[PDB]
Write a protein that binds this ligand. Structure first.
Ligand SMILES: O=c1ccn([C@@H]2O[C@H](COP(=O)(O)OP(=O)(O)OP(=O)(O)O)[C@@H](O)[C@H]2O)c(=O)[nH]1
Ligand SMILES: [Mg+2]
Ligand SMILES: [Mg+2]
Lengths: 147, 147, 142, 49, 49, 49, 1254, 49
RNA sequence: AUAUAUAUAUAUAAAAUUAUUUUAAUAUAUAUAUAU
RNA sequence: AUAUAUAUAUAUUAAUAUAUAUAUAU
RNA sequence: UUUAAAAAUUUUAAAAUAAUU
């Protein structure tokens, strides 16, 4: 099961739902201005601005993604054993996931792939800020070596 | 410590200063409005009493008297217990310990209020030096009168 | 624990009961052991005090605050007499330098109202705690 | 009472002569054990007078 | 019984105690308004006379 | 009001719920300070009309 | 007419007219038994109700839709409810019930679920499963009572037939309206009528042991059982509590609106706060006067010592200043159509402007009118609604504030900018100080902590077994044992000889499910953790305990509630002071790994490291693990047993928990569910919750408050508060006292702003504080306003009894305990004393006979505590309920009547030529046998539970079981060496003085039995109890117990009324006012409880701690038998060794035993005289000390003299004085000793022979 | 007390008469207490002034 | 592949605080006294 | 005739669900 | 010369009733 499947099956999909998050900020007026207000002229965004953004990103993840996943993973469990991926253990914990929960990790710098790959929804900067938000929604625990 | 500003003012108008005659006259009037009643002056003493209790760092507990008395040795085969008699007659009736603060607040008013000790506190129609429970009454009155 | 596997001594508080159980008769024969005892502290504190002798440069064993007569002795009492006796026996085995002045001021506190002595100021009056002392600057001139 | 005073005096008199071996232990055997344990020890003694 | 049994808290520092026990009663200003009442009382008495 | 607004803007600029460098409610007594409002004109009279 | 013609003598007897007697009692009980439900509803038909009880009933209550549209089926084959409004509508709906029933064979108008539907559902059909789930759940909702409602209604008619009563104190008949103004009875009768219709059978369903049979009528629904239970409760409360009939109407209206809605329990749950929100939380917007208590809290606040200092008058400045409760209350009232009721309450409340008895009675009446039903729903709905909640963590700990891993744990960097650092510091210091104590390193403490959780209650041993099976490890089964199967004793016996690395795989095993309903709250949930999971969670609970008891020290756990917790509310609600009520919503679901458990585990893993460097904890090895906390270094570092356990516990907490749900109400639901909610079955639960509560509040006030608020007022308010002087918490709930300064009550806007700061503080790390600031106290379900406790009568439903399963109830005589509990619950709530006593008389007959019959004489009920009325030709209503229960109570009520008691005997025949010292010449020995006094007195003392006999298991397997259990208990060589040395020393010295000296080898022989009696009783034991009761009834008795005989030699004298101990104008408990004469006089002349006087001779020789398997009785008797005979001290030391104590510790205990001469333990063990339950609220301590005088009134007598070496006798004398004084109605009086027949020395010798014979 | 001392103290039993006796004895003390004598809850015009 | 009757076996429901009540023959026999 | 206590003696150990096998019918 | 203070311990392990988290 792809990692994006549980978020793609929504009328406004999840990433589209979070792209409209710049309205809650005090003033941004556009997604590019959001990516500029968050991290400065490299990655490692401003922690305070990232926190102000996370306080808005969180209710989208607790009230929409968790209820949708709680049904999607049940429907998937009904039709056989499947190997499912996710972006954070909190996704599989809040949505009450059954099975073995294996955290994992890769020996590379994953943040650079978010600039290498091109044809993704929203700018590459938005994909990267989204990855930061998932990493901030992560409930620190040992990822333990994908191999 | 209160603070006042130090700079060119704006010419306030705070009319709060009056002579001594204008104050003694009102004192005479409000003392004339209080003579002989005793239901007009009791609540003032009660209010000052509760204020004294709230401002004072003093506590009251009869456990001090209990522990002090418990160290004297009394015979088990007797008919009179000096330590056990004062402990009995040293518990106030209707369990009110207010009379202390009320007497302490009556010091501010001896021209219109005279705090006397109640007739019930005396030895009930003549004492007798041959009576232990009746000798503790003299002890209590002697300690309590000077206040 | 090393002193445990080594030492031949072994404590027997029944000696106290044997000695006290031959008095005919507030009862002095029922104060130290049967009453005034922590009930959970066995005698590891003893050999911890013994092991503290080797390390008076970094560690300074002192008598706990909770083993004093609780704000005044009042020698008229009996439990406080026993408390004084036990503190006076236990103090010499510690390693802090102010054990003697604490042993003196325990009785000085207990005998307030009966006997008086001149102190150094009005902060460390005779009615202080014996444990509030323990700096060499706080030993009374008297 | 005089009875209580006599009882206290007698208790003190007997406690003065209780048959305990901890003092002679402390003066005869305890320092020997401390000296025997001191060498074989991870953190050597550190004393001031 | 009040005279015989008294007690202070064990953490009593007098200045620190009174510094915040006495503060809340000097933050209200009813005493200053109790003077204009006396002004008007004296004015009324003199006007009647 | 302007001190309060400056404190709030400072809190927003430093991205905190409460600004650390505050311009209002300092320890100083500044009850005589003024500013330029639209209440008074150039003659010194009020600006009701 | 009918009830009168049946039992007029009984009406006369219990109504204080005719002297009571056993014959009228048993005849009335006959009338109760031989009596039918049609007779009940006909008797209800005889009542000519007035217009006052009239009321418009909604007709929609009867025509209801079908159940099919309310349910559906999940993608996981789970039948679950379809919510129509909100995610709360998951309770039983209101639907028809007739189309699913098949006619019962005997009673052709009643029936249960058709077997066709059940079988078709068992086959696997959709509609059949849905219908059977609906039927079973409706039955379970209708089974939540303790007996058939018609029996309670009959008892009510019995009691009320007598009419009004005469007050011996007020000298007048009380004005309580008769049954013709009782609109609950009217609604009950009208609903039963309109449902029955033309059918002859009148009961709409008959409650039975197995299940309920529904009356087959088209006008039937599933809401009727709870509605009828509500109406019965309201009727009984109005008749025995004097509720005014103007608020019972509103209660009945709300119950009707509930029964007319979609679902009943859901409406009652959404509408549970209309009476409190409009009466208690809105009182006194305008004060004019009244008195409130003046308590003063003593200085070392942490110990909870108080002192009452009189009543201070109230004034206008103390009026209510909390924020208004108007807009929200009217919004709630409008959303559900209850706007007229809300407006009526909001109007009637604004007319009380004086803190008075009448206003507190108004609040009590307004709050007794809320329904007291046990809410019920399917288990698969509880598990799917509760366990899906997850924390809402708005400011998580940054990922760059965790070091590398050390096994399963990461450490907080010391330079963290978060707020979790203070949490980490608190738990770290607590763990270090806990582990530093030398007590936690002996085998005895290890063994005590091991045996703490080995109980006879389930622990889901199955999944443990089948998880150990998955790694090819065997386990004994012990085939043929009469012991229960699902018990932690069974698990422990299995897991004796197993290394930790084998059983450690069973730490990740799942847990079974438990359920339990409540009043006005969703059905509880439970999870029992197995033995390994309870073992590995030891450091967590130990550190939580150390925090609760030493470091933070702001809690009421471990303290007596009625001596320390009641006057806390009395102090925190008095007017100058104020109270804020803080609660954490969903506390279990808010404690997870991402904020709390990770920090706590790192803290407990680091703090223990210093003083446990290589040692094993409770049977856990000293494992190793590599760490990476330091950058650039990666080295394997040894750890301890207490750290190995934290490793395993962390790898359990990280994944969450998996619950195996299998409900017996829906066929086809046995799924498994996985949550992150913290369990509610762990030993460490209730302590860590309160530790976290206190820690977060203190870090609040010390750090987070001053760094986010700017106004000087809130800063000065948060700086003057500390958790130890202004905060009290226990588990979830909490309380924050705010003292009043000299200017009066603290300002309201500042307190509000602090409250919203607390609300913002909770959201940063997950918690959701439910804060309530409105001028009333709240703690552990105790309400207070202006220092007046207000009992919540809706929380104690008279008829309600809870049944979270389908198992049948315990057979009679098991219900008499519940009836006595009903009486006592009525006692503690201050009901009208005459009315409540009479109703309890009428109710203790209906539950007295049942099938070759066996009947209780009334004397048994008088022995259990129920106070008499008119026995022996005395005055009506002389005895109060404060008379204790048992021998003391019997002596108390006898000695007050003894002269008349004997002259009546002599006046009807009973005469003999034997001058008894007690009763003179009358022959009590014949009459009391005739009057059935001895019979009841000795039948009451017989147990009413089937004593589970051993079923004679095989010798081989039983020996193996007990041996493996003992091996589990004494696991390390040190305990075994201690006990073996003790046995050797005993056989050297103590051989002969005792034959079976108790040790740590008899613990398994008690765990084995405790596993036995957890099973079900057998018909043999039931018949045995029945025959034993019949035998004990059919003897001929010659005297009371020896203790009561010795008691009856003492006489007393009622001399003087003691001075008042509280003002007669100060309300201290709502409902206890001059209208309630006897409780008022007792309270005002004895005074409330504010002291600590526990343990009136609970002395014992064994002052140490051992395993929970052992008993204090055996060791105490052994030490007493070894100390009275005067054996060598080596015998005492050998006993204390083989009871599992250290050498030095056992010898210190031997010295203890040698002190404290044994004349007191012997009496304490021979006599059983304790303070009864009802005296807990009064000040009995000063009554013992000062107001029961052993020197009689006119001096010495030569009879009351007591020898110098018999001091224990003064204790029993003070007993008898206090009991005889408290039994009589009116005010408590000074009682003096009068005369002891025989003499002081003779009575002392009588007690002394008994003390010696041990 | 007259009627009670009439009645042969050894042969006393409970009675409404005894209840009334104790109640009157009890309420006399509360009536004669001085704070109870001089006290009130509601303010008068003069005290409010 | 199934249905019914029978017999056997198995699984399931917790922790804590508070207060009250109960937990040294199992039985018989001989000699002693007493009560009914 | 019964019971209580005294000394001794003796024996003595204390609801829903599922699985399996038998039988009868299809 | 006679009398007398007597110990206020615990956290008491389990089974039933009631209150609560
Ligand atoms: O059925 C449970 C009820 C609670 N208690 C224990 O009390 C603690 C808290 O109990 P709860 O977590 O159930 O209270 P709550 O959140 O439902 O409060 P509200 O939202 O209704 O306001 C838990 O730790 C649990 O162990 C259990 O012993 N029994
Ligand atoms: Mg709740
Ligand atoms: Mg709760």
């Amino acid at each position: 099961v792809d990692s994006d499947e549980v978020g793609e099956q929504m009328e406004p999909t999840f990433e589209h739902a979070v792209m409209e998050i710049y309205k809650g900020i005090a003033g941004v007026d556009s997604l590019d201005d959001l990516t500029k207000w968050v991290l400065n002229s490299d990655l490692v965004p401003h922690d305070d601005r990232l926190g102000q953004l996370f306080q808005a990103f969180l209710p989208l993840a607790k009230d929409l993604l968790a209820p949708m996943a709680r049904q999607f993973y049940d429907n998937s469990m009904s039709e056989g054993r499947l190997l499912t991926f996710a972006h954070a253990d909190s996704e599989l914990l809040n949505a009450n996931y059954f099975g073995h929960l294996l955290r994992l990790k890769i020996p590379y710098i994953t943040e650079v792939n978010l600039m290498i790959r091109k044809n993704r929804e929203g700018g590459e900067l938005f994909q990267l800020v989204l990855s930061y938000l998932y990493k901030m929604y992560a409930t620190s625990a040992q990822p333990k070596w994908f191999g | 410590t209160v603070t006042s500003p130090y700079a060119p003012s704006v010419n306030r108008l705070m009319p709060y200063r009056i002579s001594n005659a204008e104050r003694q006259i009102s004192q005479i009037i409000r003392v004339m409005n209080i003579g002989n009643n005793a239901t007009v002056i009791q609540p003032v003493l009660q209010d000052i009493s509760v204020l004294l209790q709230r401002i004072s760092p003093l506590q009251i507990d009869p456990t001090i008297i209990s522990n002090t008395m418990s160290t004297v040795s009394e015979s088990t085969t007797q008919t009179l217990s000096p330590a056990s008699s004062i402990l009995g007659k040293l518990r106030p009736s209707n369990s009110d310990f207010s009379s202390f603060r009320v007497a302490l607040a009556g010091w501010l008013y001896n021209g219109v209020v005279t705090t006397v000790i109640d007739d019930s506190s005396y030895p009930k129609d003549g004492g007798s030096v041959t009576s232990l429970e009746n000798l503790w009454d003299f002890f209590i009155l002697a300690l309590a009168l000077p206040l | 624990v090393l002193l445990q596997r080594i030492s031949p001594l072994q404590i027997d508080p029944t000696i106290i009961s044997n000695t006290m159980s031959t008095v005919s008769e507030l009862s002095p024969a029922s104060s130290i052991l049967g009453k005034l005892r922590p009930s959970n502290s066995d005698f590891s504190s003893f050999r911890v005090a013994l092991a503290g002798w080797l390390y008076n440069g970094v560690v300074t064993t002192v008598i706990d605050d909770s083993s004093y007569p609780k704000d005044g002795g009042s020698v008229t009492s009996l439990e406080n007499l026993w408390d004084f006796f036990i503190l006076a026996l236990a103090l010499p085995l510690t390693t802090d330098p102010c054990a003697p002045v604490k042993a003196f001021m325990t009785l000085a506190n207990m005998m307030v109202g009966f006997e008086t002595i001149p102190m150094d100021n009005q902060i460390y009056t005779q009615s202080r705690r014996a444990s509030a002392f323990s700096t060499p600057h706080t030993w009374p001139r008297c | 009472t005089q009875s209580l005073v006599s009882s206290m005096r007698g208790t003190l008199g007997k406690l003065k002569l209780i048959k305990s071996m901890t003092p002679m232990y402390l003066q005869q055997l305890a320092p020997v054990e401390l000296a025997v344990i001191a060498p074989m020890l991870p953190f050597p003694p550190f004393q001031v007078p | 019984v009040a005279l015989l049994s008294g007690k202070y808290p064990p953490d009593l520092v007098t200045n620190v105690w009174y510094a915040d026990a006495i503060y809340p009663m000097y933050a209200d200003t009813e005493v200053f308004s109790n003077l204009q009442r006396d002004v008007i009382t004296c004015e009324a008495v003199q006007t009647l006379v | 009001d302007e001190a309060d607004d400056a404190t709030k803007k400072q809190a927003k600029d430093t991205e905190k719920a409460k600004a650390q460098v505050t311009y209002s409610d300092t320890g100083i007594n500044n009850a005589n300070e003024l500013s330029r409002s639209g209440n008074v004109d150039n003659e010194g009279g009020s600006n009701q009309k | 007419s009918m009830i009168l013609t049946q039992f007029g003598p009984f009406i006369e007897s219990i109504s204080g007219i005719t002297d009571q007697s056993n014959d009228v009692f048993e005849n009335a009980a006959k009338a109760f038994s031989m009596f039918t439900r049609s007779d009940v509803y006909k008797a209800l038909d005889e009542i000519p109700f007035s217009e006052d009880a009239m009321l418009p009933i909604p007709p929609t209550i009867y025509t209801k839709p079908s159940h099919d549209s309310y349910y559906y089926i999940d993608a996981l084959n789970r039948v679950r409810r379809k919510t129509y409004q909100g995610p709360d509508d998951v309770y039983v709906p209101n639907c028809s019930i007739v189309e699913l029933l098949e006619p019962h064979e005997t009673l052709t108008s009643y029936g249960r679920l058709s077997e066709a539907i059940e079988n078709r559902a068992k086959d696997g059909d959709s509609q059949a499963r849905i219908a059977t789930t609906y039927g079973r759940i409706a039955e379970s909702q209708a089974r939540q009572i303790k007996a058939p409602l018609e029996k309670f209604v009959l008892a009510l008619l019995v009691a009320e037939a007598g009419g009004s009563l005469y007050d011996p104190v007020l000298q007048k008949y009380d004005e309580i309206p008769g049954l013709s103004h009782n609109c609950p009875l009217w609604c009950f009768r009208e609903i039963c009528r309109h449902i029955s219709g033309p059918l002859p059978d009148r009961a709409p369903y008959l409650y039975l042991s197995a299940g309920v049979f529904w009356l087959m009528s088209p006008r039937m629904t599933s809401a009727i059982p709870p509605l009828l239970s509500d109406l019965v409760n309201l009727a009984i409360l109005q008749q025995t509590a004097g509720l005014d009939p103007s608020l019972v109407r509103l209660g009945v209206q709300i119950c009707l609106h509930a029964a007319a809605s979609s679902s009943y329990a859901w409406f009652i749950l959404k509408t549970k706060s209309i009476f409190p929100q409009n009466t208690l939380h809105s009182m006194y917007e305008s004060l004019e006067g009244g008195y409130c208590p003046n308590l003063e809290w003593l200085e070392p606040r942490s110990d909870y010592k108080f002192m009452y200092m009189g009543a201070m008058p109230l004034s206008t400045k103390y009026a209510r200043s909390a924020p208004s409760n108007d807009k929200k209350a009217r919004e709630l009232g409008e959303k559900y159509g209850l706007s007229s009721v809300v407006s009526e309450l909001r109007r009637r409340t604004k007319t009380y402007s004086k803190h008075d008895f009448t206003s507190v009675r108004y609040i009590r009446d307004a709050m007794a009118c809320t329904s007291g039903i046990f809410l019920v729903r399917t288990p698969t709905e509880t598990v799917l609604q509760e366990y899906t909640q997850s924390p809402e963590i708005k400011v998580p700990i940054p990922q760059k504030d965790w070091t590398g891993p050390i096994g399963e744990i990461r450490i907080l960097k010391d330079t963290t900018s978060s707020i979790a650092r203070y949490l980490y510091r608190t738990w770290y210091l607590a763990a270090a100080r806990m582990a530093a104590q030398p007590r936690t390193w002996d085998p005895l403490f290890q063994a005590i902590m091991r045996s703490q959780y080995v109980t006879a209650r389930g622990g889901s041993g199955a999944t443990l077994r089948e998880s150990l099976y998955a790694i090819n490890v065997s386990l004994p089964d012990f085939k043929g044992l009469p012991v229960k199967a699902a018990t932690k004793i069974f698990q422990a016996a299995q897991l004796a000889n197993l290394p930790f690395s084998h059983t450690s795989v069973a730490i990740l095993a799942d847990t079974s499910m438990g359920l339990r309903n409540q009043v006005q709250r969703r059905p509880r949930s439970i999870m029992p953790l197995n033995v390994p999971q309870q073992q590995v969670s030891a450091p967590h609970t130990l550190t939580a305990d150390y925090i609760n008891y030493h470091m933070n020290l702001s809690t009421t756990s471990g303290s007596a509630v009625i001596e320390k917790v009641i006057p806390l509310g009395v102090y925190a609600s008095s007017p100058p002071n104020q109270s804020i009520n803080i609660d954490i919503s969903a506390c279990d679901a808010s404690i997870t790994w991402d904020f709390f458990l990770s920090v706590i585990m790192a803290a407990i893993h680091e703090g223990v490291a210093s003083s446990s460097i290589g040692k094993p904890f409770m049977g856990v090895p000293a494992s190793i693990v590599n760490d990476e906390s330091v950058v650039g270094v990666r080295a394997a570092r040894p750890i301890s047993g207490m750290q190995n356990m934290i490793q395993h516990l962390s790898k359990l907490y990280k994944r969450g928990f998996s619950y195996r749900v299998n409900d017996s109400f829906s066929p086809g639901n046995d799924f498994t569910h996985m949550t992150t909610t913290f369990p509610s079955g762990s030993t460490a639960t209730s302590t860590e919750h309160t530790a976290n509560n206190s820690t977060m509040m203190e870090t609040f006030l010390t750090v987070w408050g001053p760094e986010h608020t700017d106004d000087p007022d809130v800063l000065r308010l948060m700086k003057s508060l500390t958790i130890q002087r202004n905060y009290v918490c226990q588990g979830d709930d909490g309380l924050m006292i705010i003292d009043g300064n000299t200017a009066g009550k603290v300002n309201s806007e500042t307190i509000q702003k602090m409250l919203e700061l607390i609300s913002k503080y909770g959201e940063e790390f997950g918690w959701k504080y439910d804060i309530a600031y409105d001028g009333t106290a709240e703690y552990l379900k105790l309400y207070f306003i202006f220092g007046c406790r207000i009992p919540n009568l809706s929380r104690h439903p008279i008829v309600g009894k809870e049944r979270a399963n389908s198992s049948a109830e315990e057979p009679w005589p098991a219900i008499l305990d519940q009836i006595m509990g009903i009486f006592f619950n009525g006692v503690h709530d201050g009901l009208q004393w005459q009315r409540w006593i009479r109703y309890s008389w009428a109710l203790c007959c209906a539950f007295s006979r049942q099938r070759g019959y066996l009947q209780y004489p009334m004397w048994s009920f008088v022995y259990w505590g129920l106070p008499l009325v008119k026995v022996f030709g005395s005055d009506p209503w002389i005895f109060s309920w404060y008379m204790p229960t048992g021998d003391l109570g019997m002596y108390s009520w006898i000695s007050l009547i003894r002269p008349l008691m004997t002259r009546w005997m002599v006046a009807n025949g009973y005469v003999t030529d034997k001058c008894s010292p007690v009763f003179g010449n009358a022959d009590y020995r014949k009459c009391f046998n005739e009057l059935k006094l001895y019979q009841g007195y000795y039948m009451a003392q017989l147990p009413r539970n089937p004593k589970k006999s051993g079923r004679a298991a095989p010798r081989e397997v039983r020996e193996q079981f007990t041996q493996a259990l003992s091996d589990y208990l004494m696991q390390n060589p040190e305990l075994k060496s201690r006990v073996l040395r003790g046995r050797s020393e005993w056989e050297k010295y103590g051989a002969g003085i005792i034959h079976n000296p108790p040790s740590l080898f008899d613990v398994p022989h008690k765990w084995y039995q405790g596993a036995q009696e957890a099973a079900t009783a057998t018909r043999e034991e039931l018949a045995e109890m029945d025959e034993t009761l019949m035998r004990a009834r059919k003897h001929s008795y010659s005297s009371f117990s020896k203790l009561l005989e010795a008691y009856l030699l003492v006489k007393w004298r009622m001399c003087e009324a003691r001075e008042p101990s509280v003002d007669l104008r100060l309300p201290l408990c709502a409902g206890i006012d001059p209208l309630n004469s006897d409780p008022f006089l007792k309270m005002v002349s004895v005074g409330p409880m504010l002291q600590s006087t526990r343990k009136y001779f609970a002395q014992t020789l064994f002052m140490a701690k051992t395993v929970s398997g052992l008993d204090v009785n055996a060791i105490d008797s052994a030490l007493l038998r070894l100390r009275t005979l005067g054996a060598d001290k080596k015998a005492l030391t050998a006993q204390l060794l083989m009871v599992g104590l250290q050498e030095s510790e056992a010898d210190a205990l031997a010295g203890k035993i040698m002190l404290q001469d044994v004349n007191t333990v012997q009496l304490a063990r021979v006599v059983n005289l304790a303070v009864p339950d009802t005296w807990m609220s009064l000040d009995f301590d000063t009554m013992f000390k000062h107001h029961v005088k052993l020197l009689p009134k006119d001096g010495r007598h030569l009879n009351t003299d007591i020898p110098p070496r018999m001091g224990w006798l003064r204790a029993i004398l003070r007993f008898l004085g206090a009991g005889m004084a408290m039994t009589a109605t009116g005010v408590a009086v000074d009682i003096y000793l009068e005369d002891i027949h025989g003499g002081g020395r003779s009575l002392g010798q009588r007690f002394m022979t008994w003390m010696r014979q041990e | 007390a007259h009627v009670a001392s009439h009645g042969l103290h050894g042969n006393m039993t409970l009675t409404s008469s005894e209840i009334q006796r104790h109640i009157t004895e009890f309420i006399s003390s509360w009536q004669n207490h001085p704070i109870v004598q001089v006290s009130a809850d509601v303010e008068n015009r003069k005290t409010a002034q």
